[PDB]
Every structure is written in C-alpha cells, then in structure tokens.
Design a protein around this nucleic acid. Structure first.
Lengths: 116, 71, 177
RNA sequence: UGCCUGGCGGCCGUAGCGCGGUGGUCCCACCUGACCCCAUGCCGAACUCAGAAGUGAAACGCCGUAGCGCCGAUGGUAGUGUGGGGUCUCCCCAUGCGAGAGUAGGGAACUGCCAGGCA
RNA sequence: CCUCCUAAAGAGUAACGGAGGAGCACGAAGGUUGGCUAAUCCUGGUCGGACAUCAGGAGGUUAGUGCAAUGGCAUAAGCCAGCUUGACUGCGAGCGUGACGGCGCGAGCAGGUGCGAAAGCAGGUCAUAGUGAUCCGGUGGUUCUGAAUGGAAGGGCCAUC
RNA sequence: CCGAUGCAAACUGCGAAUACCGGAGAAUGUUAUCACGGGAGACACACGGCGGGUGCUAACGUCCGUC
C-alpha cells in the first residue's frame, strides 16, 4: 500500500487547510511527469494548473521529470499566479518530502516573489 | 457494599448562536466540528462566528458534523 | 546483480519453458531473506543474546535489532517487553552474495544429510527452514563458539500456490528430500 | 465534440464483497546501483537521484455475472397523545401520528473542474 | 469527588437504591516535524505446537489511551526517530451552569519563546474524581498610610509556605 | 465449546407517539410575556385518575413523574 498511505497522510493537511478556507497549491510528483495545481477554497475548481507533459514548457527540457523540469513548472506556475492575482495562496506538500524536487519547485515558485 | 452532570446539546439546529457559544458539551466527541466550529481540550464544540447551526452527515464513516452558516 | 544475471539467463528460462507463461517476470521473485533465531534460551542470561547478536552482525553485512516480547502468560513464566531474539533483513546485493555463499559451500556439509523438507511450507509458497550447528558456516570459526544454536531462514515467494515454490526450489535442482 | 488515463471536490454500500474477461496509443505501476540531497528503532524497509533496457507480474481503470450485501414502496402489524367504557392485574371504542422486518422495484453507481493520448 | 440503570427517547426527578474507585500519578506520560500504526486467527520454524522469538498470509480497529469503571478515539485522542519547555506574563469577547462563595470551555490582542520551508501548533498531561474555603501562624516588595516634624512600632495591597 | 432457537435494569446492525429547542404563519386571548421596585403570605398538605419502583408481582401496604 503506497498510494493509499500517501493519500491518507496528505489528508491531514488537506483537511487542516480547509478550516481557514484559503486557496491551496498542491503538487503531484511522478517520475514521468510533474503537475502543480491551485485549488480554490471550494475544492472543485482549479485556478491554474501546470504540467510537465504539455510541450509549452517541455521543449527546452530534456526530460519531463527532473529537477530542472520541477523548477520550470514552479516558475511557470508563479508567473501565471502573478498575472492572475492569486493573492498569496498557501502550500501543501501532498504528503511528500520537502527535500528534493518538491523543495526545488517550492524555491522556484518563491523566487518569482511570492509570499507563501 | 453523587450529583448528576449536565450533558446533551445546548443549542440545536436553526439557532442563531453567538461566537464562542457551546453548541454541545458532551462526554467525548459525539459530533465533530466542521466549518467555523472549534474543539476544546475537553472535547467541547464551540461556535467561532455568529450564524445558524446545522448538523450534517458526511464522510465514509457517516459521522455527524456540527457547522455554522451565515446568519 | 552478481547472481541475478545468471538467474534471469538460466533459471527463468528453464521455468518459462516448463510452465509456458506469457509475462517475462511471471516467474515469482524473491525479495528478502530474513535471518532469525529460534533459540528461546536467552531468558536467564542476557550475555548469551548479546554474543549471538554479535555473531549475527559478524556473519551478515548489518547488525540486528533486538526484538521485545509480544504477550505475557503466567503459565510459561514470561513478561511483556522481554528481549529474547532478533532478526536481520537483507534485500539486494547483500542477499545475492549471502545466498550464493550459502548454496555453494554451506548446504552440502550437514550431518545426517537426508535432504530438505519440502513439506515444511507456509502453504502459500514461502519455505522456512531451521538447522543447528551454525559452526558449519565459515564466517564463524571453532575458536569463537559459545554454544550450539539453531537458525531460521525464510525464502520470500510471491506466488499464490505451492507449485511455483516447488519449481523455484527445484531451480537449484533441490538435491533430494 | 466522443473513447481512454491521472489529479482535485460533492455523494458514502444504487459507491461494497466474490467470479470471468480487457488496458500499454498516452498515462500509471514493477527497478536496476546509490560510494552522490536524503536514511533505516537492522534492511534503499519507506522517500530521493537516471526510463523504456523489458513487461502489465501485482495494484489500479472498464464490461458482464443480481451469487452475497444495500436501499426501498403501497399495505398491514405492534405502539402511542387526547376523551370515554369494561369483567379495571388487562382490554376496547372515535379521532390524529405511525414501528422494525419482509414483499414489488433499483442498482455491478452518479455528478463538477483541470490535465494528457487517440478521434 | 467521579464511573451505567431504576428515571416514563430534552435536563432533572425515591427510600445506608442498586455499583466500586480517586483521593493519585507524569515536572515527563507536556508542545511541535517526519514517518509508521493492529488486535485476533491459519500456516512454517532446534522446542514453538498458537501459547519464550521471527515471516507468508485471513482480518481492519475486537488491541490501546497510566488508573477501578465510562465514551469517543487509524487524518488514532497511538507509536519510533527529533528539538525544546507555551506547564511563560498581562489578559480576554462569548458560552455552559449554579442560592452564594465560584467552577469549566473559550475566539482573540500586547511582550518574548520552541517546533517548522511555510501553512500553522503550543496558556500542561485524551478526558470524567484526584483536593482546601474562612481564620490563624512564616517570609519578600511597597512610605500606600503613619496620632507635631524625620524615622520607627502598627495597619493596606501585591507573591504566596 | 461449534451452529441454531427463545430472552434482558449497568444489550441495540433499526426505531415510534409523546416531551424539549429554534424558525415562519391565519385566528383568538382586557399583555395572558419580560425587567425593576413596595408589600406579602406559605415552608407536617389530603384524596383520586394515569405509568412504574418497592412489597410474598397476597395488602384500602409503601415512594415516585403528570393531571
């Protein structure tokens, strides 16, 4: 049991962030591809979603999944959020570890000038 | 070879309770806090903002949540 | 690594020819070999357990972890949390070398070598065995022997039936019963 | 706009359990070694690094199986507020509210958004 | 002083009513991050057969959570590794009860902390019992006041054995 | 003890009427409601109906909640 354990572990913060009702940035990390979504407090709509699979940002990337790809996804999400007006969404690690690609993506997102 | 304690729901559904009001002071957790509802150390559900009180069943385990909606 | 190449080259090929599967890895694979002791005689003395644990660490590539008791029963005079045994978990190159070194030299030299016990299965595919005279292994020498202790080696099998376990055991020709 | 796959919510057994079949186009999964970021209350056990080198083993998506389980009427039944009566320990009368279980029936769920492959 | 009924589905409602336990304890059994989370049963083990230990499975909260007993508890209110003392000070809208003395929960503000990348958490312990009011005696501060003046004796309030 | 059948104050995978809290509404009721102030009185109640406990499920025996 890997996916079930991951979902169960993430559910802690997933429910914790709901009490305060703030927009949340979640990241789904896979070796083949990486995705980053901004979810409104309602939980049924995503303000902005970025994926490594699409060729908009994968043209300059040798492979869809790597540290450089994570940084590119983070910067794309950050710039899109800046031009959309997210107003300092909170962050969630989706039950992952904040030491590798997750940390790289978070640092890339914060580089643009975000305050999360 | 004592003195009874007061339990049960103090504020039911539809009451426009005030912030900090004790909706239910129960033994443990008969109902779980939802939106705009806290949980004290003694497992007491207290309102966080003015509004109407509602009870709703949600979750795979079918557990009742006490929630507060706009007045 | 060292033995997995030969495994895939020969054992997988022979078993595939025998059973006529479709998926290349349809042959069940072994994940880990758990080294354990059923000594059950360290209750009086803790130094015996300490020495046996040192022996396990010496023979294996990693040190064991002391395990506590599960239940307390007055009939057998056992409390809760009592440390009696320990286990070693191996998965990967260490396991490949351990298995090769064992099956090469250690297995043949057994007193009363009447064969293995295929009937001693879990009923689902795993085979667990225990023999005395750890002195047989070369990592332990005669000059550093405290007492005779039994072993417990359980091979990991992902199969859903005993036929696959029998085939895997016969892969190394299963000398005899 | 149709089929397929993942993620995020509502619904919490009409979403479940058992059985047969199908999925490598994309996606997802199995994994090599880790002396490198990271680590084991021992184990690269779990997370992290490079994919198609092979595959769909197991999990998971879908179709059928109503076998199990679930919901579920109308009706009746027990019960009960009110006023009265009797052989007054108990029951009945007029009126209002109405069980559980089972039967008919359903279902192998549905719905909102984003992403990707084939059309 | 607490743990269920008689007590007729809100609370309450009887007769040395039916029932025991606390009158402790943890200064760690407190707070924070990551990860993990069965019991029970079939089967293999030198004995181990289930019963002195381990791994392949059925099963998902029947184990546990310090207590006699009780509810709720797998996003476990548990259970491994980590860092500390928020068990800090002034407080505090509102609420639950009470005849009073009062008791409990509590959003949130100011100072400064620990855990964290952040989101945020921490004003003791999973909780219901686990304690002491009035008076009296011991100590520190205050010229606040002081029977003419400056002190002092003696009082008044703050912490508190 | 394995499965089944009946049964219960410290038994409920379900579940009434009744009672309680709150919201909306026509009609009636001399505001019958709430708050403060002055003045009180009373502080061995009895019997009966309704549903129980207790009692030897013998008593015009005993105590409860409602009228």
């Amino acid at each position: 049991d890997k996916k079930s354990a991951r979902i169960r572990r993430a559910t802690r913060a997933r429910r914790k962030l709901q009490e305060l009702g703030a927009t949340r940035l979640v990241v789904h990390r896979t070796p083949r591809h990486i995705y980053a979504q901004v979810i409104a407090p309602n939980g049924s709509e995503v303000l902005v979603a970025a994926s490594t699979v699409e060729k908009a940002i994968a043209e300059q990337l040798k492979y869809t999944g790597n540290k450089d790809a994570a940084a590119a996804v983070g910067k794309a999400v950050a710039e899109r959020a800046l031009e959309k007006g997210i107003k300092d969404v909170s962050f969630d690690r989706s039950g992952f570890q904040y030491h590798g690609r997750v940390q790289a993506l978070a640092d890339a997102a914060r580089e643009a000038g975000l305050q999360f | 070879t004592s003195e009874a304690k007061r339990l049960g729901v103090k504020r039911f559904g539809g009451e426009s309770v005030l912030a900090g009001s004790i909706i239910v002071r129960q033994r443990g957790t008969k109902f779980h806090a939802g939106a705009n509802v806290g949980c004290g150390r003694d497992h007491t559900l207290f309102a966080k903002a003015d509004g109407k009180v509602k009870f709703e069943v949600k979750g795979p385990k079918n557990r009742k949540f006490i929630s507060i909606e706009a007045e | 690594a060292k033995l997995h190449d030969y495994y895939k080259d020969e054992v997988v090929k022979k078993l595939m020819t025998e059973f006529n599967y479709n998926s290349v890895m349809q042959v069940p694979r072994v994940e880990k070999i758990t080294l354990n002791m059923g000594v059950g005689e360290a209750i009086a003395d803790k130094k015996l357990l300490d020495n046996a644990a040192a022996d396990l660490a010496a023979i294996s590539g990693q040190k064991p972890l002391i395990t506590k008791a599960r239940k307390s029963v007055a009939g057998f005079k056992i409390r809760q949390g009592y440390p009696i045994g320990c286990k070693v978990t191996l998965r990967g190159e260490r396991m490949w070398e351990f298995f090769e070194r064992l099956i090469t030299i250690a297995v043949p030299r057994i007193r009363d070598f009447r064969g293995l016990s295929a009937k001693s299965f879990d009923g689902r595919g795993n085979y667990s065995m225990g023999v005395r005279e750890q002195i047989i292994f070369p990592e332990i020498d005669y000059d550093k022997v405290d007492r005779v202790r039994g072993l417990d080696i359980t091979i990991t099998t992902t199969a859903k039936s005993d036929e696959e376990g029998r085939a895997l055991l016969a892969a190394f020709d299963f000398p005899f019963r």
